[PDB]
């Protein structure tokens, strides 16, 4: 159980200056020849030369063209190649090797593997060592000269990093291509692609240097028509980095490639970004609406890496959040500017406060810069990425746009072309902080705690207003619960963006203000406040914290209606719902525990329902925002507020609350569903793949949300609407008709209809699978079995497996069936998947992350299945480590 510690970072005693690869792809094997031009570093102390190399079959290895003999000069144990030091030269030397690998049977999808008819690599984090021997860590920077050869018919398109400098024919129907990439890079940014790829291309001319950049987007021939939006998103990303950050692309060409089998969303290999097909390909006929924001985000994300990750790289993997948190932050700025909808920021906050807050209060909780790891694959987390992004975003909130851009430029200018650490970034921001505060005395040392301290801070408020003095006070307290990482938690630097709303006319009472909370508690006083305000707190969600606003529901309602800030409006609504949910939960729980024959439930606040109606009926209000206010908080947001959560009782609670609101507003919902149709479903640009209207998609989101509400409520003759809806050309609509039809005997009719519509597009079929998996059906277990037998079968495609199972695990009532049979089902799938793909097996564990937050019976059921999984003799290191930590062993 090798544990790596952040504090233990030492530079290698070796240097690798040049990599010369020959990758020869054949039918049953791939032969990899490598020459490493190496040197001895100043940190060398005469140690053995130890290479990473996992699953390589050695034909031969050499030093300076002298063959090495196994056992006396080296040992290999399928993980580490150890060359005894006495045979290691003491100046510059060449190490060479020839190994055999087998991408055809590499179902783990790391290293070099076959996806359908495409050969592709994935090297982050430790994948390069599965291709050839290397000192596989990101601070080993080298030059790369790579030749790929293959059957010309099967693999006409050959790609790698850098410039293609030669193309040549080989006897026996083969051809080769040579790529030279002179700039130094870490090995996890190496990539190679071979296949029968088709493309779209365009030319981009950079803003300041006017350099011409060739843009290529690749897929298999069948889906080449789905590439157009991706290419537009790439143009957009380049323009945004130029316009916001002043950063131009530095290379001649950028390639994006879609493959069907991929563990994650995409990978930023230099000049050769490789994508999960579901994050690159779309068409309006064959994609749900969400694909358009997904592709925008992921193309943007990999593009912004070219600076934050690729030109400024990592010293060690413990600095992962320095490239990932920073790049998610850049991606979020981009997406907010491109979509111009408030729901974009709301969707990221919604994600963080559900999924990442759950993680941060689970036994898996870690800071965004961990102190140790066993399996690096288990560190690519919503904490490192999304909390990371919020920590990166707080610098911008604290500094404002001008000084943030000054600080960012300092970072890029002072670290371009080298490795860096989180401290480097904090340093650069600190220089900006000094400039903005106008005294060299100011510092951001406390800010570093955001990197080292795990857990979600709680922030609470108390208010005071003196009418005679016109004086207003906001007393603020912060607190982080102790956990297994820090016994004592320290106060953080918390930026609190605030406004003060005049409750009589809804107007702003003060200018934009960011309170800097740096103590455990503070009191912020405001003079010349004419009337008692309602505070608008953490505008834009200005810190990743639990907000306890201590406002009445009347005050929250007033903010919901009249505040300027989308997040505070959305949060005030969230807070009203949570108070209701907690109250009704406890009433239902008490009734169940005491086996009461009768009892009372607290009704939903009637003025709250009135406010929802007011917003819904306002034509000038935003459709996406409206869809949020008629939806209760995510189950995974709710569970952070309830101990021993009885999922049945929560399901009853949600049902009561939805019914209460629907009993008042269903006629309003129906009226809107009908009136939104013309604009929401407008077909004017349906055959234009570059025309994307995020407002219109939001209108469809609202219609489909309303349709779902009206369907669960069995609104009179709604089935008619559902049937018409299924005839819509937009897959968001006709797939919605499938899931809302669950409450009617027409379900399997629509099941068959929508299957036939989906079956001939790989990605659409996967969306169909998700829709079925998530269907609110009493026979969902039987339905899942049908999917397994008829559609999924023994597919090793991670998109297929995730589609069939993950959405189901969000079925509150059915997945958490008290028998434990849902838990048993997913555990079987995890154990089955772990035999060929440990990464995806660990992803499939996600339902278990909340295990110690449930009622005691369900806790026990989940724990049993995890221990059962842990006892599998063949369990992967990845899965074992994850479950060991999750079950607090
Ligand atoms: C978060 C998302 C969807 C943008 C994504 O695909 N992330 C990538 C990434 O950062 N691309 O630039 C990602 C996620 C996980 C890994 C990973 C590697 C070893 S285990 C998980 C690598 C890349
Ligand atoms: Mg092997
Ligand atoms: Mg397939
Ligand atoms: Zn990334």
mmCIF file of C-alpha atoms and ligand atoms in Angstrom, residues 110 122-126 262-269 274 276 279 294 297-299 301-303 305 320 323-324 327-328 331 376-381 385-386 839 843 878, ligand 1:
data_model
loop_
_atom_site.group_PDB
_atom_site.id
_atom_site.type_symbol
_atom_site.label_atom_id
_atom_site.label_comp_id
_atom_site.label_asym_id
_atom_site.label_seq_id
_atom_site.Cartn_x
_atom_site.Cartn_y
_atom_site.Cartn_z
ATOM 1 C CA UNK A 110 -5.677 3.897 -20.243
ATOM 2 C CA UNK A 122 -4.922 8.318 -22.733
ATOM 3 C CA UNK A 123 -1.865 9.094 -20.599
ATOM 4 C CA UNK A 124 -3.061 11.354 -17.776
ATOM 5 C CA UNK A 125 -2.222 10.633 -15.091
ATOM 6 C CA UNK A 126 -0.127 7.454 -15.173
ATOM 7 C CA UNK A 262 -13.540 7.151 -23.065
ATOM 8 C CA UNK A 263 -13.392 7.205 -19.256
ATOM 9 C CA UNK A 264 -13.989 10.913 -18.797
ATOM 10 C CA UNK A 265 -15.081 13.959 -20.815
ATOM 11 C CA UNK A 266 -11.857 14.860 -22.629
ATOM 12 C CA UNK A 267 -8.113 15.260 -22.437
ATOM 13 C CA UNK A 268 -5.914 18.252 -23.304
ATOM 14 C CA UNK A 269 -2.961 16.568 -25.104
ATOM 15 C CA UNK A 274 -9.126 13.737 -27.421
ATOM 16 C CA UNK A 276 -15.501 11.330 -25.291
ATOM 17 C CA UNK A 279 -18.689 15.698 -25.311
ATOM 18 C CA UNK A 294 -21.650 20.171 -22.613
ATOM 19 C CA UNK A 297 -17.858 23.560 -21.821
ATOM 20 C CA UNK A 298 -15.567 20.654 -22.634
ATOM 21 C CA UNK A 299 -14.091 22.088 -25.858
ATOM 22 C CA UNK A 301 -12.044 23.453 -21.012
ATOM 23 C CA UNK A 302 -9.439 21.564 -23.069
ATOM 24 C CA UNK A 303 -8.588 24.740 -25.024
ATOM 25 C CA UNK A 305 -5.555 24.093 -20.684
ATOM 26 C CA UNK A 320 -3.571 19.118 -9.713
ATOM 27 C CA UNK A 323 -4.398 23.378 -13.549
ATOM 28 C CA UNK A 324 -7.853 21.833 -13.089
ATOM 29 C CA UNK A 327 -9.138 25.713 -16.019
ATOM 30 C CA UNK A 328 -12.702 24.963 -14.737
ATOM 31 C CA UNK A 331 -14.261 27.439 -18.613
ATOM 32 C CA UNK A 376 -3.836 9.263 -8.213
ATOM 33 C CA UNK A 377 -6.852 8.286 -10.291
ATOM 34 C CA UNK A 378 -8.949 8.733 -7.150
ATOM 35 C CA UNK A 379 -7.870 12.405 -6.814
ATOM 36 C CA UNK A 380 -9.663 13.710 -9.934
ATOM 37 C CA UNK A 381 -12.646 14.796 -7.899
ATOM 38 C CA UNK A 385 -12.174 20.474 -9.901
ATOM 39 C CA UNK A 386 -15.258 22.389 -8.750
ATOM 40 C CA UNK A 839 -11.768 3.782 -13.181
ATOM 41 C CA UNK A 843 -17.353 6.070 -10.762
ATOM 42 C CA UNK A 878 -8.229 1.703 -7.467
HETATM 43 C C1 LIG B 1 -14.457 17.498 -15.930
HETATM 44 C C2 LIG B 1 -14.454 17.273 -17.448
HETATM 45 C C3 LIG B 1 -15.826 16.757 -17.899
HETATM 46 C C4 LIG B 1 -14.194 18.611 -18.163
HETATM 47 C C5 LIG B 1 -13.297 16.330 -17.866
HETATM 48 O O1 LIG B 1 -13.396 15.589 -18.843
HETATM 49 N N1 LIG B 1 -12.178 16.415 -17.128
HETATM 50 C C6 LIG B 1 -10.931 15.745 -17.555
HETATM 51 C C7 LIG B 1 -9.970 16.924 -17.761
HETATM 52 O O2 LIG B 1 -9.567 17.587 -16.809
HETATM 53 N N2 LIG B 1 -9.768 17.241 -19.044
HETATM 54 O O3 LIG B 1 -8.897 18.349 -19.334
HETATM 55 C C8 LIG B 1 -10.372 14.678 -16.800
HETATM 56 C C9 LIG B 1 -11.064 13.994 -15.799
HETATM 57 C C10 LIG B 1 -10.446 12.923 -15.147
HETATM 58 C C11 LIG B 1 -9.151 12.505 -15.459
HETATM 59 C C12 LIG B 1 -8.610 11.449 -14.810
HETATM 60 C C13 LIG B 1 -7.376 10.950 -15.074
HETATM 61 C C14 LIG B 1 -6.981 9.872 -14.342
HETATM 62 S S1 LIG B 1 -8.256 9.519 -13.340
HETATM 63 C C15 LIG B 1 -9.288 10.779 -13.860
HETATM 64 C C16 LIG B 1 -8.460 13.182 -16.472
HETATM 65 C C17 LIG B 1 -9.083 14.255 -17.131
#
